[model samples]
Target chain A: ESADLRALAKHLYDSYIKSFPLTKAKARAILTGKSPFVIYDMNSLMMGEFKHITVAIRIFQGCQFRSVEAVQEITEYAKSIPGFVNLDLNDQVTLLKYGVHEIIYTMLASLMNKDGVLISEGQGFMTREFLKSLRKPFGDFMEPKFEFAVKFNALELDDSDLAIFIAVIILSGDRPGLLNVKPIEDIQDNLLQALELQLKLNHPESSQLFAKLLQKMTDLRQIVTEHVQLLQVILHPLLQEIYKD
Target chain B: ESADLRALAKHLYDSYIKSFPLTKAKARAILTGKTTDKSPFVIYDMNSLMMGEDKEVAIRIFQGCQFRSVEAVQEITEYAKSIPGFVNLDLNDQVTLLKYGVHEIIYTMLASLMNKDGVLISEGQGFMTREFLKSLRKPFGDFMEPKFEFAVKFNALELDDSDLAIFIAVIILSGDRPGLLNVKPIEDIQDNLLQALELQLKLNHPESSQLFAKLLQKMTDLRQIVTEHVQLLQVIKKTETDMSLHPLLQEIYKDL
Candidate 1:
């Protein structure tokens, strides 16, 4: 009985990512380039109910808050990836520190296109221009994510592709604080090879499978820099306590 | 001798690393920035791990974190003065570089101490578990966590001793510290290390094209990371205070 690497990755995705397959209902608020979140129209409708700053913060805060809650579940799945648990406990912990934002953004690719991310299951679309209005770091905030998501979606990566794709992200032994370099590189080499094999078979037309996707990881690293520093603007208690004297 | 870049890099590595004593692995620093003092951060017991309202243990834990917080800079200081052009730079500029650069350098050094479970304290004679570090205050954590934030996470890069040694040198020679005086000399020194670093990384990750760019981004990342801790430390000082930083760091802390 051979457990092929292909099925192994597919099983991991379908077995663990239970959030899919639910009736992802369409949002009541239609949003996208097709029919966008008309901010000015909505602005006139209710600058009274809440100002731009209030709603703007609410939208971002809403996204990050949900992103955090889902993290617990993702960690469970991340743990089971082969050799992931084999990582030093701290190495695994560190992976999540870097992995969470990248993982969240990568998974969110499921909810986007070139225009923007779908705010609701099928409801409000958070378009590029809609996020643009919150330009005082708000738009700068979500803008890069949209750019990454646009290219990511173009990859047409399916669940199977993401399953292994995520494995590559986690095994990137280059994260800063690591001391166990050789072991991690050894495992990551295997993971990268698995991913490289899977991509061509899954998406036969992908001429630049490894290069394009690997580049996305670098892009993710840069995006992480922007997101983390921006995190200062959206302060939290955990960070406050951790950084304090 | 031929252009033995590898030999040259090896020489720099030994010169800097040997500058420190044959001291045991120091304690893990409390803050991300200062690391020389190696505060003896041993977990007292199982009960000490949790964050509670009656939280003597949680608060005390942060105190031990501040140890060697200053002395680690001295470690960096000794190494910086040994750099070729660093001695030639202005005295004031040199001081500023250490002040700005110490945090990044220490964290870079701390990476070597980091392991899978948690960073070893007291020269691997002690251990801290990933699970135990969970509770800091009000179910919030990571003054030590900032160390966790970068320490574990930065390891993703898979750099070795040679890479780290050169990388640490690059941080000290950086020309872009907000208030640098002799920008040209500092920039010159920094570029040379970057040159050494680029070649080594190429040799190390032959197939990987963007590793150089990715590692450089961490410099920017480290700068931002320290500023937050600086900002984080400021907020805490106002609420109550811990002035335990070594006298050298006491002065540098104010400027840093």
Candidate 2:
């Protein structure tokens, strides 16, 4: 059972990661009207800060638009999982709410390097220092995620590992208010067991790799939580109408 | 509309915070196994703490903390469902919102319940000193410090129960959770909650600039704290050989 799940995880990883590559044209366009780079000349410090904010907001807005569409795609992907669709419709939504961002981060983690995340398949990169210099809430919003990305990249997980890892994240059985715990737990156990086996064979030198992978899931969750918080505050006007019954 | 929501939020905060109080004596007794009922407790001294002992103690502490959190989630869920247009949400979205949002809510309660010194372990029972908590283990002790840090900053906002009620509502009905069959409805609920909170904050804390932004920032802080704690748990669980985590905690830890 576990072996089959492991195979499924690998298959999922291949298909899922392939679907979400950053486009070079999109990445280049986002950086275009913006300052070619984050500029901080002391003479123009105040004006520079203002310019930086303008650019940061532009970059952030672009990223937000991209993520919203990406989030939708991933949501659809999550719905297609075998046991996932069978769960209560509410349970399905709940799992996806909590699970989707984690998976997105997991995918994003693949494109990460020690300094920052790759944009457009290494055609461009967003540096951590530049991200930190963005205006108040925007800086607050982007930094922690980059911090997580750097640390996650340190784990050195390959495609197969991330594949299984994403599965475990999606199949989480402990989400509050889950209607059917048994099936979810069963699927999770199988995936985890499969992941452990894969890790052992894939990274024979590192015994702690599987546990480390598990820990990354928590990191992803924390990042997503922060992301949601930032969105609520910054987009309250738009959100209010959307949430209003 | 704003005043009523503010009043409602306060009522919810008061009842919720009141339900969980940290007492020093009770906490001490529970950890020491002195009570007639004998709740789980472990003295975490790094030098004296063996791997075997560490796991046992970690599990006890986790069970104690999680039992409270789980129950709180249940109660909060009930409270949320009773709100106007809340139950109107698809049951699945409600659960999804709860599942994703509960940890943030749990931490919000923890922040509200904590003081600069430390959090109460049990109502009228005992207080766990921050100094003592820091002495436990490297990352484990470090994990909790962020919560206290956030609490100090969050509490500084002096948001009363009314302000909290609407804020809590916003926290629970988040539209970002990935699999919502309908994101618009949840967002609409959150919109109303935020709208109420905006008016309340304006009326109540007019002197404060971006108070809403500051409050929202704390949500990130809460997430960071939970992440740190989860990491610490993973470290302890990984290093300790005989560690036996509660099934529920195991599920939480396993939850990706």
Candidate 3:
């Protein structure tokens, strides 16, 4: 029965994949295998997963969150994850204002803990607006942050996320906390396995969250790994740390 | 009292700095901040410290080792009081060779011993060789590598054997690094700090290696917080999960 459902899902996915075709013209001519230029960037890798949880979260945040602390609390919760950073908040809002509507709900819920909460009700929404301003610059998500996380963690990755992971692995390879190369790599692998397990165990409606996550992870990769916005994320701290003087 | 030694050191350094004036002209231009049109790059920083000791450790590979490795350790130790990587047998040879002729032998010997008996090697050389082969193609294909042009060109950093803890940060800021942001601003700050330090220290020497090391540590605060390299290092030390991360990092080794 699940096989038939997957087949059906596969068929649906194939049709959608064809619609969002990978074009050589779209790819940068240089094969740096490095990012923002090579496609499949760090953030894009994770967008696949984040997208899955976005719709419900966004709707929850959109409708339910009535106070600033609620949204802030949600964001703080996102940060509570082992390797979380403030940048996650920036990425979350960027996804929403860009009209990537399906996941908006989930990301909002993840942030506001309410899929339908109105952003106006929150204090953090000011910074959230700034992220929204940055949405257009982020453009069509090409890289995935989930994949970035996967690579950031380091694992038996595939052709898809390997390149993005290489970049994040190199970048975060120097940072502190839970996302350090080893644990991050372990966690990354775990996240992927979790996705696979969810798809295996659940039905389409039941698996909608996982399905959406897969899409979000991919989009996150496109934005963080492949887009110019990475420059901002990478440089912001440098600006704060080095250029302040 | 140290000021007098510093003045004398400055005189010696002037001769040393300009020693190969013309030979290092090309290299010097890099220090002056030259640029590449297609690939925008500049060597905007340089720092120097004198070695209190003279002998340099050499690397050998019954255990593997090299000439530059020895030179770097000897040089870095004399100036900074620490050998970054393990010294090769060849490095031992080079130091002995240099000490055989120079009046600085005793000083070199002491410095070599005082500095850590290890030398750290940059992965740049092998990376360059690979890129060199790749470049043999009419236009060279590596134009796509994260640091394609950076790997291929004569290292504008122009680090000499005497230097310890040289950091070169490059940014294709115009383009990529997926999850994070452009690292150039912080890198720029580092470049400026080194340049200023170089200029200030240039006129003052015979300053202890300890002082030079202190200056370096100070400058690191400007850029160190930004690079995640140390964080990854902590991770590596804590969790033995990924060995590949080790190879990607610059390698440092030591001798008993």
Candidate 4:
């Protein structure tokens, strides 16, 4: 019923997993920041200099710019996944555009924790309270990602799992403006098949984690819709082009 | 005494307000089910609504810098609406004036906001260097340079704010806008704005007697700049830059 998922998952891991991997030292830094945390940017962490919301939004905007940059690599990673290249170029770009932000949200788990999410690379933590302390109605904008991450981390997926999770995201034929849906959806079915096989082999005892993650994706998709709300005034040029929505 | 100028000042004041409109948008979600678990409620959840509104802001920000330029021109359009006796005119006649006069208004205002090397953006929150503007795509890429060049040379005279706004009022209130229902009323207001503008210029730059006539000719130059830019930005509206022409601007230019 499916292609060689064993080969496919390894291909995805080989192509995509390299972009992420922070060392134990780096992980400790982000983990420390997770709780209220920094090492490289330890100076400003104490001063509270960027306490203003304008500066906060600007730096967050920079991270989004980075996310826009991150999409190029993600698009390359998408090509390595099974059947993604078979879709029309029109659908290729569309899937990449819709999927890039969601993929970033997934990667954000590595950079986030129960207390806060990292901002300005590894420089500082925009704590949960500090995040909600935004300028105005914007105060609530980012909390959904943190809330999702809190639960998402419980599955405790490594990059190999994350690589396939993102593959399902890319092949998620529901993205608007796609020219052909079934082919893309077929690939996702192949991927979902691969995902269960990996789930059984790696964490066989946990029967519901596959269905649990698929369920979690419902809000994950909604969360990007919410994040897209913040990108208004589309500061970055590439983002303006990529964001056809 | 105060009564006479008050009407004139109020018109100018109202002009500026309606020009730069700041607004927001909203979104919602619905729940539907097939079997036992299907729910019958439509949720326009506050969170969903806010999220949608915010997403609209993102969409509004499309077209990169070209539309941002539209945002600048929009305030100028707002001010045009406030000119003495303009609001009373037939709607098509006012639309005609806005259509004909946008170039004049946009280019005229550019002088103050512009510099030889750069222009102020984000309503003066930031000043982007000319080098920063180069990524603007071709056909549309060099579109601003000529208008900006005009702005550079015009700002060389460095007219005061009162003179600038007053001159913009004259350009807007002109009977010259084609297809007017009542040209005479507009011409009459244009006459007063011109008269007020002359005295204001004399009050400040009294030594430059030629500057009054010089300013009149500058209005003539402003028209040509917008016409040329339209030719350039027209192709841009189709290009990858996909210039996010504001509706007010699109409506005005559609005729042209």
Query: Using alpha carbons, what is the TM-score of model 4?
Result: 0.43
Off by over 4 Å in 3: A1-75, A78-118, A122-179, A194-212, A225-245, B1-129, B133-142, B146-256
- lDDT by residue for model 2 (A216-242), tens: 555676777767878775345874353
Residue A9 local lDDT, model 2: 71
Against the unseen true structure, what C-alpha lDDT does each candidate score? 0.63, 0.62, 0.27, 0.63
Q: Lowest-lDDT window of 10 residues in candidate 1 chain A?
A: A20-29
Q: What tens-digit string does per-residue lDDT give for candidate 1 at B81-194?
A: 777788788989988888878888877777666654566654444456545666556422555566666766577777766677777887787665657777878866765676
Pairs clashing within candidate 4: A229-B55, A232-B58, B15-B79, B19-B78, B25-B53, B33-B38
Instruction: State candidate 2's DockQ.
Output: 0.04
- Tell me the docking grade of candidate 1: incorrect
- Name the 10 consecutive residues with the lowest summed lDDT in model 2 chain B: B46-55
DockQ of each: 0.03, 0.04, 0.02, 0.01
The per-prediction i-RMS, to one decimal, reads: 8.6, 16.9, 20.7, 33.1
DockQ, ranked from best to worst: 2, 1, 3, 4
Report the lDDT tens digits of candidate 1 across residue range A58-171.
Answer: 776667555755576568777767777888888888777777777777877676666656653344455567667774877688787877776666666777677777766776
The local lDDT score (0 to 100) that residue A79 gets in candidate 3 is 34
Alpha carbon lDDT at B12, candidate 2: 51
User: Candidates' TM-scores?
Assistant: 0.48, 0.45, 0.21, 0.43
Q: Between the candidate structures 2 and 3, which one is better when assessed by TM-score?
A: 2
Chain A only: TM-score of every candidate? Answer: 0.76, 0.75, 0.27, 0.79
* Candidate 3, B81-171: lDDT as tens digits: 1211113223433233222212122112212211121111121111112232233322222212222222122122223312212211111
lDDT of 2 at A242: 38
